[PDB]
Design a protein around this ligand. Structure first.
Ligand SMILES: Clc1ccc(OCCCCCn2ccnc2)c(Cl)c1
Ligand SMILES: Clc1ccc(OCCCCCn2ccnc2)c(Cl)c1
Ligand SMILES: Clc1ccc(OCCCCCn2ccnc2)c(Cl)c1
Lengths: 537, 532
């Protein structure tokens, strides 16, 4: 690198694979260091499609690490052309199978002594997502809390989770293996950045939180981190996993659909189809009333997942663990405009009672006739069982409770009974800049920008109370990552966030108001979903 | 001899007795025969009208209580003994009483007829809490109440047989109703304004008069207090009534229908009463052996079917409940409950208790009742489980049947008013944890707090006068509100749209909406689909 002597000396770093040169980024309160697009794996292309990730082979020279790399090949949403509501979640770099890269944000210059590491695993229903989206920007947590923050790309869709269980050519869960490979990479290499590999906190949202949860339940991953944060997502629940049988069913059907007639011959054929043909058909392998399930998700393979997540969280020893879990207020609203007839982002979506009954069949696709009517009866307001606004909102909560809030509640409760330290929250602030209609309240996903600090960017037109709020949340998260306790010990002025225990079931509300402690995490309704409803299901 | 106290009814002369109420006198006519005594071969048979009589029949005194079980759980205890017979037992008991203002009313007065409850196995028109002197004195009402046969004597049925056709206890009530039609005018009562009212089993009976056509032309308005014709306990099937009679027969030594009944007529009354209850699987402790039968005659179908398909356009109804219907039933049937301690039970107990309260229920339906009634913030708190156990029994047997009846009658034409009674009597001798228990609204309706010697609070004296006004305003008009009122809040009709009902307590009328709407949607709409 004949130009080293004239480049910035504070942006050169050596890792196990070679040298990198990062970039000095401006954050509102000062500069940060950013190292973007570090390969942590051999590009999982050609013969390596569906295969487990192979560790990146060393390079010569200084790797340019100043820009985000490719987004893992995935479906791109087009329901609403040019709409910020969906576009903010869309890929912001070129799609490519060659996408296994990660990013590191640190203070500038890099910390003198070992600094706690947050690793971000993104959501996107396992069919989408990228570590380079504006909403996952590590610069604010780095600049303001002094955090080292790592976020990796992992394979999604067929490429990440298509399995023919028991084969060697497509064992499944490779997308979770991508994540683990990045975790290992952090273990060997994060010290070279000022990162403390003995204090690593995973955090994620939705399918990401599900991924975090799965690393908790998979033993090879348990030595790669110390604390975890699950936001609006769980490894248990109706959507985050499938059986070996079901995964086998779905791969076979997708193979027929793209023209592919012995497991080896089948996978060899799939490997020849262009990436876009897989994406174009991946959705078409479900009854398209299962509009609320994705086809290629982590599989219960007896290997990565030794048994079902519900089994492992019912029988597991968790004294080790500290976990911060939680939900937004209206988890279900978002999805309604994509699956239930009568719903739109553009009108008020007041629905009929028949539309409600129909929506419950689509929301609980696994349900029998009896179970559906039980859900319908439980969520009806008998004082106004025809009121269209109460029915719109009830539809929202059926989808939200069944798929996120009650899975979280179940996980919180089980982890606490089996030794873990648990902190529970409900996030109740609607972003002032939100472009989804008012009726959706605080939708799924829209706490993420507050955890990451985006309101500190004055360019983004948040309120001044939202700046303050984001700083409180950043402190909660980084405090938890540092100590396993979101509270600031140097501060008893502020109200305390008590642990969540099976006796008092306390949890806090996150909004512009001071912390408020509540009891029972939607306790009556989730008893219905987690205890009774699994009979007629 | 007082001419106000000498009345002539269609069967002869009667002499009454001038009684003292707090605000003055009333004429009472106690112990009037309305049927031939149902003894010997008349046992189990429909009543026959009383034969006429010579001279002046002494009607100054309460007649005998219909032969019935006598409660022994807490001997001497005021709380229980107050429902116990207060005259001697006899199968010779088909008499009714009549209260009237003194002097006898100038102009035809609205008549209220009281049908007591006590589970179709007990009850007497002569109990102190059914005392008609207060409603008669203060509101000028003519108040009637009859004894009807209970237990095996009233309801043992061999469906299809001619000598034990069933429902004779209800036919006893019907006869007293015709009696009031043929005779109440001589007392200044108005045969054209007759309001039935009753409590529990009595409320059920009242409902079955609504649902039986021969009865329908004998009254104009009805009042159902904490009981229903529909529900889990008020009726049995033809087949089941037969199974039960036959097993009662074999238990006392008997033995063909005619043959079997004949042998039963030979048995001393207390033999029948002794084996009365050993006759159903004893998970059915919250269930009595001999109750109205769906005979195809008095009840042309199940009450459910009839309230689902009937036209109730010319009927006004006043229905309601108390706050803790299920309390009284706990100390008698559920392990862990007593009048003497605070009944703080374990979750194991609550689970076992639910099997009792819902004896009919599949495993899954019990599990469903358990999960619906658990408070998941404190799923093991004894105070929470105790209170829930009481709510399970009360909601399943009274509150949700009342909600269902209210809603059906409203939907199909009837003018309905609904209440929930929430004052606990200052004089109550049951423990505090039982709240406002089944039956303890009656004394306020009847105006017993007006008797100063019973030591009720002055507010209760004012409360009781209010309820007496609702009930008699309803008798007079079909509407509990005052036609030139006290300008308090109005009591709205109950409708299948606004589901409005009032609270009756010391504070002014409060309008609420949905009578345990969520919980009763569970019992009447979902839970049936679960033993099915
Ligand atoms: Cl609660 C909930 C709602 C939706 C959902 O998944 C929607 C996948 C939509 C996939 C669309 N797609 C992918 C490729 N082509 C279309 C899941 Cl896993 C869970
Ligand atoms: Cl062995 C026996 C005796 C009584 C009882 O339940 C009492 C119901 C209430 C009896 C008094 N009452 C109240 C209103 N009318 C009569 C039960 Cl489950 C069992
Ligand atoms: Cl919610 C409820 C509670 C009790 C009950 O019935 C109790 C009968 C008690 C009979 C006692 N007895 C009479 C003669 N021998 C025993 C019914 Cl039908 C309904």
């Amino acid at each position: 690198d004949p130009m080293e002597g004239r480049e910035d000396p504070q942006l050169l770093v050596r890792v196990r694979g070679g040298q990198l040169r990062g970039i000095r980024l401006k954050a509102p309160g000062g500069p940060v260091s950013a190292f973007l697009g570090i390969p942590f794996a051999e590009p999982p292309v050609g013969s390596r499609r569906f295969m487990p990730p192979e560790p990146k082979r060393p390079w010569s020279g200084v790797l340019d690490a100043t820009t985000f790399q490719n987004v893992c090949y995935q479906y791109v949403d087009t329901l609403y052309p040019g709409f910020e509501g969906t576009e903010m979640w869309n890929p912001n770099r070129e799609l490519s199978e060659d996408c296994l890269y990660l990013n590191v944000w640190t203070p500038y210059p890099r910390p003198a002594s070992p600094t706690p590491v947050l690793i971000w695993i993104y959501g996107g229903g396992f069919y989408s997502g990228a570590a380079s989206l504006d909403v996952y920007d590590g610069r604010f947590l780095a600049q303001v809390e002094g955090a080292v923050l790592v976020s990796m790309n992992y394979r999604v869709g067929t490429f990440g989770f298509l399995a023919l269980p028991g084969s060697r050519e497509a064992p499944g869960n490779v997308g979770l293996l991508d994540q683990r490979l990045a975790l290992q990479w952090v273990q060997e290499n994060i010290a070279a950045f000022g990162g403390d590999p003995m204090s690593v906190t995973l955090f994620g949202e939705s399918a990401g939180a599900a991924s975090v949860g799965m690393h908790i339940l998979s033993l090879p991953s348990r030595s790669l981190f110390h604390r975890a944060v699950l936001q609006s997502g769980t490894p248990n629940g109706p959507w985050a996993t499938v059986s070996a049988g079901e995964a086998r069913r779905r791969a076979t059907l997708l193979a027929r659909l793209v023209g592919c007639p012995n497991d080896t011959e089948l996978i060899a054929c799939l490997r020849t189809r262009p990436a876009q043909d897989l994406v174009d058909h991946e959705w078409h392998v479900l009854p398209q009333e299962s509009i609320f399930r994705f086809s290629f998700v982590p599989v219960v393979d007896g290997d990565f997942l030794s048994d079902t997540p519900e089994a492992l969280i019912n029988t597991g020893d968790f004294q080790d663990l500290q976990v911060l879990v939680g939900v937004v207020k209206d988890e279900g609203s978002y999805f309604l405009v994509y699956g239930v007839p009568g719903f739109s982002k553009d009108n008020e979506s007041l629905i009929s009672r028949a539309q409600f009954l129909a929506g419950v069949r689509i929301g609980v696709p696994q349900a029998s006739d009896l179970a559906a009517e039980a859900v319908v009866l439980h969520y009806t307001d008998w004082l106004h069982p025809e009121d269209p606004t109460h029915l719109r909102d009830a539809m929202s909560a059926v989808v939200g409770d069944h798929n996120v809030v009650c899975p979280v509640a179940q996980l919180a409760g089980r982890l606490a009974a089996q030794g873990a330290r648990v902190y529970a929250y409900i996030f109740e602030h609607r972003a002032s800049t939100l472009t989804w209609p008012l009726w959706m309240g605080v939708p799924h996903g829209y706490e993420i920008e507050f955890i990451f600090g985006l309101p500190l960017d004055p360019s983004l037109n948040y309120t001044t109370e939202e700046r303050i709020f984001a700083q409180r949340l950043m402190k909660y998260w980084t405090n938890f990552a540092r100590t396993g306790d979101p509270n600031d010990p140097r501060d008893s002025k502020s109200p305390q966030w008590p642990p969540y225990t099976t006796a008092a079931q306390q949890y806090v509300s996150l909004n512009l108001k001071p912390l408020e402690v509540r009891r029972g995490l939607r306790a009556q309704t989730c008893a219905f979903w987690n205890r009774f409803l699994p009979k007629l299901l």
